[PDB]
Amino acid sequence: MERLLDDVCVMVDVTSAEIRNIVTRQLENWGATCITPDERLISQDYDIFLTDNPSNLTASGLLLSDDESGVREIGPGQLCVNFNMSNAMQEAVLQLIEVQLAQEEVTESRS
């Protein structure tokens, strides 16, 4: 029972205006600085990325699923987490920060 983020910059780009407001309240309680993904850039500097709907994910991070009741992984760097259950988002945050710290950059993009 603590501020899981404490003072962590979280870039949260949620298309659904209302859902963004909801999740913002949640992250802010955890001590997450909800930042915008710039305006014209592809991405900006952050610690954890959050987005609404899979199509909004610029690369990897946490995707909010209103159709979810928990937190599930659908691929590397892709996790569908529901915003209704903050306990589930809690696990998602912890897993995200850990996997990001472990695999910060893996250039598996072969050309």
Q: State the burial class of residue 105 (Cβ atoms within 10 Å of its Cβ: 0-12, 13-18, 19+).
A: exposed
CATH of residue 9's domain is: 3.40.50.11620
Which range of residues forms the domain containing residue 22? 1-111
Experimental method: NMR
Counting the structural domains of the chain, the total is 1
Q: Is the dihedral of CA 76, 77, 83, 87 positive or negative?
A: positive
Tokens of 30: 């955890």
3-state secondary structure of 88: helix
Distance in angstroms (rounded) separating the CA atoms of residues 46 and 30: 16
Q: What angle do CA 50, 88, 22 make, to 5 degrees?
A: 55
Please identify which residue in the block is written with the tokens 């955890």.
Answer: 30
3-state secondary structure of 108: coil
Tokens of 77: 């760097």
Kindly list the distances between the CA atom of residue 93 and the CA atoms of 57, 80, 108, in Å, as whole numbers in the listed order. 16, 12, 24
Torsion of CA 104, 83, 64, 102, to 10 degrees: 10
